[PDB]
Amino acid sequence: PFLKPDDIQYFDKLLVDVDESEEQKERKIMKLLLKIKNGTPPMRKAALRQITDKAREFGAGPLFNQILPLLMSPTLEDQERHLLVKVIDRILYKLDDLVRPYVHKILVVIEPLLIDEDYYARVEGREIISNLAKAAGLATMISTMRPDIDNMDEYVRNTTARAFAVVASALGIPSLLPFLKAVCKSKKSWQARHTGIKIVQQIAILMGCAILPHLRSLVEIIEHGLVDEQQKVRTISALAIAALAEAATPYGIESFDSVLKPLWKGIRQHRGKGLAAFLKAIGYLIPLMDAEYANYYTREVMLILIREFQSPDEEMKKIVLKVVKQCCGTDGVEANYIKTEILPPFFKHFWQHRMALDRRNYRQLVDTTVELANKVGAAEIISRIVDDLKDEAEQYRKMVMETIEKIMGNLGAADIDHKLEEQLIDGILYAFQEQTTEDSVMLNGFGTVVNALGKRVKPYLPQICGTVLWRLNNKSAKVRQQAADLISRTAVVMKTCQEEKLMGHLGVVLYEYLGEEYPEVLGSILGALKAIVNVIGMHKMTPPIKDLLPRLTPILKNRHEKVQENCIDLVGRIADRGAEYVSAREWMRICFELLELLKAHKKAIRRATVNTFGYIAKAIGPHDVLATLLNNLKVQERQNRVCTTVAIAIVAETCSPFTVLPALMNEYRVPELNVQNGVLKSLSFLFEYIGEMGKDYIYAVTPLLEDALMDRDLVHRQTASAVVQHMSLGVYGFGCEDSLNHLLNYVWPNVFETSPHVIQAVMGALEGLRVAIGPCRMLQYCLQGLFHPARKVRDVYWKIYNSIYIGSQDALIAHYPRIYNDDKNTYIRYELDYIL
Amino acid sequence: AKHHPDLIFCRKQAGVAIGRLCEKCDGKCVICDSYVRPCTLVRICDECNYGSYQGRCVICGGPGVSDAYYCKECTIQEKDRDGCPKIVNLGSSKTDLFYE
Amino acid sequence: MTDRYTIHSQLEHLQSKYIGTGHADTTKWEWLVNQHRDSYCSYMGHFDLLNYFAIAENESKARVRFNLMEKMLQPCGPP
Amino acid sequence: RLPPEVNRILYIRNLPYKITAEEMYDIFGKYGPIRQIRVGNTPETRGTAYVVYEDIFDAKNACDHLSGFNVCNRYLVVLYYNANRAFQKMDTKKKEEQLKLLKEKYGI
Amino acid sequence: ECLEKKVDMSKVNLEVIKPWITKRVTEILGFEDDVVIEFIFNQLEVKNPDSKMMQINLTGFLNGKNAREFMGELWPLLLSAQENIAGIPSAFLEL
Amino acid sequence: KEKPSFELSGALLEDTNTFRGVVIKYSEPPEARIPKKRWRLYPFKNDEVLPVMYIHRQSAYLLGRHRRIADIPIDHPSCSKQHAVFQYRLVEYTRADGTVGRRVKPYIIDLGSGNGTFLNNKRIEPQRYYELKEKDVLKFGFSSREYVLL
RNA sequence: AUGAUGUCAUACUUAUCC
């Protein structure tokens, strides 16, 4: 597969056709890389495996020699990068002692993955450095990575710090401690100590909550940098304290203890970024102190906190913001003091159009404001920010809107007075009437506001729903779906207040849009109908179901991901609840239409589908519909079938399977194999759902499992084995064990194979058989296999014997046989032979 | 599980944080990965639920809405008395789908 | 003091953390000692089995419990 | 008044396998003094060459006039070469001696 | 080897071991760094240190030959300091 | 002590316009084009047009008192290195018929000389679109000049 | 008459996934 015009430089050796005459042939055959980089997806797959199994063969040297240039390529893609990352992982699951010379030679390319805009790139990078460090040795990593500490560029120092974070997560803090503790005391130059401290931080972020045990030692390291003559070291130091305390869940306060007294002092004398950093640290600290000591100390911090609102620094504003959250979100702080001193400057400087356009500042601002509401109360905050709902820009409106949302979510709408409530509803409608983008914030916002107001909202309905219909035209593509969803979430409120005319409106009006050709709208429409069904009942539906349901029936062709979803859902609600209003003929047509809905690429679609199919199975009764399931061609191998199997299960539940089984068991006869294993699955899920009731049917299924478990082809043994499992859990304790032993006979030979699905299947099988039969019989099959020095039987029988061993280890005692004692050892336990 | 075989669980110490399930993974079991017979609720680890890691799904890892529960077949097989089955690793799933 | 033996990790796999499970390369004496330790723990855990073991012998319950706790470490000797 | 991406190195292609470095030096020598020139002697890279000048603007006037310029039957591919990375095939070292020298001679 | 005898850093001084470790690090690594001195300070900070872990941390730090001699020289001086009733090595009694 | 200011640094401006040995100021806008009108530089220092330079064939033209920056020297000791810059560019104007379009005309704007400039015994200020035409009596120096161009 | 490996289609599983 083709070569980009640049990649020639790398792959030129492949171009020449000289062939068939040692190492040069290994580099030459190693161009399978090219097949991984560019080509068809299958070529990438097969190539990837082929190079995985050749790891031990080719060795890490030639590979990395032929890779690292590519992953270093200036023209590298996104995908190609990620794929080469994959091959590096998969080969590094194998090679262990081999990589030692290349470790640095790896990290140099990989460390740039840690600092990246892409998140998935970062989690990948952390993963592969974890695999590398754990793969190599500790001393390998340490002795490797020293010279990058004092490197002139700070880039490598930084990304190297995150590297030490990852490797420290791998091999644990205490192993790597003396290295660090040695580093931060290095007397050569400051840059080192700066690095090592940054390492402390990135360890704090990465490990997070798990820092807890070594917190003391870590602090004892870092403390000496706060007083250092250099500035950076001080700044990054206190920052690292911050990260610690933030991962320091409400405890280890005294471990930070000796750190405080300098910090507070510094709080006085500092100008610039370092100051803000200290404020960050102290900020995360205060929640960890005692409300008495933290009373004083807090009251001291509040002053500077006030004074420093006004700085243009955005780092500043972030810090002091989150600070205000923690300091003023303290239970030991008085409302009125905040109400006077803080709120007016807070809404003055902080609420502006510089903030909201940014992302982090947006969020953090939301949170802090939410908490201030949590203390001073509701009507204050909201009352001050309502007037901004009507502000021009979107993002700002979005901000105050979600703020109001969370506020009225927590505190409740009860505190709100009347006039401010008028400004509320008008604000929310007005903001909702202009929507540049589609998003939930405005909608969830409105819904939460109304559901919180309760029936105080009643005078406002006609304005609401007037807007709802007029908007319900305007633009279908953009706003139809949105006004529809608005109805959906406002259903219950439009119900409990007992406005019936409005339910007539929404009922037939929405009924009319079911002919809408745009799917993304229609979906929202059906959703709205759904929500309306859950408030007003069956027989009171203003569009009587006789009208509605057959009008729904043809829509199932619609392909669309949202239409199919909501549609099938609603057919489910009505098919489950009333179900009498519609004649059976319509129903069976619904069936023959439902059958091909199982091509859905989405799992929830199939979910609702099968459950519905059960409901209508109740509405009619088993035989016909289970026959219509058995009609299935099985045509698709990758699933698309076994959902029908699930329908066979649930159908067998909805009316007693005590009826249904003979039809199925007969339908195993058919020579077509894939449907044979199909009905095997049907038995599996069947027993999984029936549980206890299998105390009878075990016998019926027993000989057929004999026929199936006796192998035509592996899938028979597998699926049948799964059946044995779920049967074995289900029947437990009821006294049927005998036939389960018989079936265990035929289960037992299948123990040996390398196919993952059949071996894990058999494992589940013998586990369920363990609990059902009891360990004694198991162990009596597992004894002789232990001994076997043959590199197979011992592997397996010891795997089994372990599975039997972990559970029920208490009950095994009696069943260990008598084993005679040799020369040096006494192998007879004589306690059991004490006789009265 | 049956969908992702290369995924590894957390298996950490059990805390007092009750587990939750996302709206896309609602009703699915954690160990048995089934939809019927819920018998025991899911408990999360202490490090697995802290700050932004609280209120997240165990299997899906997205925004959790409803509380997750374990299957009765996994409860009778003593598969629910193990550690916290939080999905930590995420490999060969939702990686190439972001590019398309 | 070059040892060239750093049983640290490889690819976050295996790393036995349980006690009494065993491996495929487990010896007979190690498995017998683990079975004897499991039998001693089951005798110390079950109250009815400990009562039936102490009713036969002329020793008391706490003396037999201390003897079973003292005989747990190195029951056979050669693993 | 220059785009940043262009560099003193130019990748040049659509060369014959017989071509002589005499013609090379002569032709390319119009715009400025040659820093040096490499030519692929290897099975894939034969037909390609890299030219490096004492100054960039040299190369700029070059690709200006030499754009699609002709030799034999061929119109050469003239592009500004991209050497973002140093292929790390070589290393960063040997700075100590020269830096010790400039620290010695001028004493600075 | 020489890293099999159990020792204890609580019965020995720390200020007298800094110059010998500094001379060993200057002989091994050529120049004076701040990571090796910090590693030597972290290896002796515990009251019961580990000789095998220190050898692994310094067993590969150099090349795998000078680090073994450095560990063998640091284990014998610590053993001579812990065996003495004063708590000092043999190089501190003369000067 | 590090004195951070986060202001406009000179290196980012010098890397955009990099000459051989000096900085390059007085850049043209993006609306510059090649001239197609009949206009030639007729320099008369002693009432005899010895040299002739084409202004429509070249895109840039720098004249000064330095031999390393400029291509050809000039015999004017009372003129600075950066005194005047005559560059042709099609600006937004109207023709005689009233229809709008692109007309190639020379742009006249002072670059901030120390002693200024004079054209037809009159000083012109910068940032002012003056109607520049052919056969203008200009001066290529800061104070005075004994040579005119036509 | 099994088994061996290897080019090469074909079905099946993973409730695989936009």
Swiss-Prot record, chain B:
**Domain of life (superkingdom):** Eukaryota
Q: Which residues of this UniProt protein bind Zn(2+) 1?
A: 10, 45, 48, 84
Site feature: Interaction with SF3B3 = 16
Q: Which residues carry this modification: Phosphoserine?
A: 93
Q: Where in the cell is it found?
A: Nucleus; Nucleus speckle
Q: What are the site positions for Interaction with RNA?
A: 99
Record key words, sorted: Acetylation, Activator, DNA-binding, Metal-binding, mRNA processing, mRNA splicing, Nucleus, Phosphoprotein, RNA-binding, Spliceosome, Transcription, Transcription regulation, Zinc
GO terms for MF: DNA binding; RNA binding; zinc ion binding
Q: One biological process GO term for this chain?
A: stem cell differentiation
Q: Which residues are listed as membrane-spanning?
A: none
Which GO cellular component does the record give, naming just one? U2-type spliceosomal complex
Task: Name the segments for region: Interaction with SF3B1 and SF3B3.
Answer: 34-50
Q: Its family?
A: Belongs to the PHF5 family.
Q: Which purpose does this protein serve, as stated in its record?
A: Component of the 17S U2 SnRNP complex of the spliceosome, a large ribonucleoprotein complex that removes introns from transcribed pre-mRNAs. The 17S U2 SnRNP complex (1) directly participates in early spliceosome assembly and (2) mediates recognition of the intron branch site during pre-mRNA splicing by promoting the selection of the pre-mRNA branch-site adenosine, the nucleophile for the first step of splicing.
Supply the name of the protein: PHD finger-like domain-containing protein 5A
Source organism (scientific name): Homo sapiens
UniProtKB/Swiss-Prot annotation, chain C:
Q: Which residues carry this modification: N6-acetyllysine?
A: 17
Complex and partners: Component of the 17S U2 SnRNP complex, a ribonucleoprotein complex that contains small nuclear RNA (snRNA) U2 and a number of specific proteins. Part of the SF3B subcomplex of the 17S U2 SnRNP complex. SF3B associates with the splicing subcomplex SF3A and a 12S RNA unit to form the U2 small nuclear ribonucleoproteins complex (U2 snRNP). Within the SF3B subcomplex, interacts directly with SF3B1 (via HEAT domain) and SF3B3. Component of the minor spliceosome, which splices U12-type introns.
Q: Which family does it belong to?
A: Belongs to the SF3B5 family.
UniProt function note: Component of the 17S U2 SnRNP complex of the spliceosome, a large ribonucleoprotein complex that removes introns from transcribed pre-mRNAs. The 17S U2 SnRNP complex (1) directly participates in early spliceosome assembly and (2) mediates recognition of the intron branch site during pre-mRNA splicing by promoting the selection of the pre-mRNA branch-site adenosine, the nucleophile for the first step of splicing.
- GO terms for CC? nucleoplasm; nucleus; precatalytic spliceosome; SAGA complex; spliceosomal complex; U12-type spliceosomal complex; U2 snRNP; U2-type precatalytic spliceosome
What are the recorded GO MF terms, alphabetically? Answer: RNA binding; splicing factor binding
Q: What would be the name of the gene that encodes this protein?
A: SF3B5
Q: What domain of life does the native source organism fall in?
A: Eukaryota
Instruction: According to the UniProt record, list the residues that bear N-acetylthreonine.
Output: 2
Identify one Pfam family in the record.
SF3b10
Entry keyword annotation includes Nucleus:
yes
Q: Which UniProt keywords apply?
A: Acetylation, mRNA processing, mRNA splicing, Nucleus, Phosphoprotein, RNA-binding, Spliceosome
Where are the Phosphoserine residues found in this chain?
Answer: 9
Curated annotation (Swiss-Prot), chain E:
Q: For the region Necessary for DNA and RNA-binding, what residue ranges are annotated? A: 1-95
The residue ranges of the PWI domain are 1-95
Q: Which domain of life is it from?
A: Eukaryota
Task: From the Swiss-Prot or TrEMBL record, state where the protein is found.
Answer: Nucleus matrix; Nucleus speckle
Modification(s) after translation:
Phosphorylated on multiple serine and threonine residues by DYRK3 during the G2-to-M transition, after the nuclear-envelope breakdown. Phosphorylation by DYRK3 promotes disassembly of nuclear speckles. Citrullinated by PADI4.
Annotated segments matching region Necessary for mRNA 3'-end cleavage and cytoplasmic accumulation: 1-95
Subunit info here reads: Identified in the spliceosome C complex. Found in a pre-mRNA splicing complex with SFRS4, SFRS5, SNRP70, SNRPA1, SRRM1 and SRRM2. Found in a pre-mRNA exonic splicing enhancer (ESE) complex with SNRP70, SNRPA1, SRRM1 and TRA2B/SFRS10. Component of the minor spliceosome, which splices U12-type introns. Found in a mRNA splicing-dependent exon junction complex (EJC) with DEK, PRPF8, NCBP1, RBM8A, RNPS1, SRRM1 and ALYREF/THOC4. Interacts with DDX39B, CPSF1, RBM8A, RNPS1, and ALYREF/THOC4. Seems to be a compound of RNA export complexes that are released from speckles in a ATP-dependent manner.
Family, per the entry? Belongs to the splicing factor SR family.
User: What is the official name of this protein in its record?
Assistant: Serine/arginine repetitive matrix protein 1
**Gene this protein is translated from:** SRRM1
State the covered range within the intact protein. Answer: 32 to 126 of 904
UniProtKB/Swiss-Prot annotation, chain F:
Q: Which cysteines are joined by disulfide bonds?
A: none
Location of cross-link Glycyl lysine isopeptide (Lys-Gly) (interchain with G-Cter in SUMO2): 3
Output the PTM entry.
Answer: Degraded by the proteasome upon binding to the SMAD1/OAZ1/PSMB4 complex.
Q: Which domain of life is it from?
A: Eukaryota
Q: Where in the cell is it found?
A: Nucleus
Taking every annotated instance into account, which residue ranges of this chain make up the domain FHA?
A: 61-124
Q: In which tissues is it expressed?
A: Ubiquitous, with highest expression in heart and skeletal muscle.
* Disease annotated for this entry: Neurodevelopmental disorder with hypotonia, craniofacial abnormalities, and seizures: An autosomal recessive disease characterized by severe psychomotor retardation, intractable seizures, dysmorphic features, and a lumpy skull surface. Patients are hypotonic and have poor feeding in the neonatal period.
User: What the protein does?
Assistant: Required for pre-mRNA splicing as component of the spliceosome. As a component of the minor spliceosome, involved in the splicing of U12-type introns in pre-mRNAs. Down-regulates NF-kappa-B signaling by competing with RELA for CREBBP/EP300 binding. Involved in the microRNA (miRNA) biogenesis. May be involved in cyclin-D1/CCND1 mRNA stability through the SNARP complex which associates with both the 3'end of the CCND1 gene and its mRNA.
How is the quaternary structure described? Component of activated spliceosome complexes. Component of the minor spliceosome, which splices U12-type introns. Binds SMAD4 and CREBBP/EP300. Binds the SMAD1/OAZ1/PSMB4 complex. Interacts with DROSHA and SMARCA4. Component of the SNARP complex which consists at least of SNIP1, SNW1, THRAP3, BCLAF1 and PNN.
- Give the protein name, as stated in the record: Smad nuclear-interacting protein 1
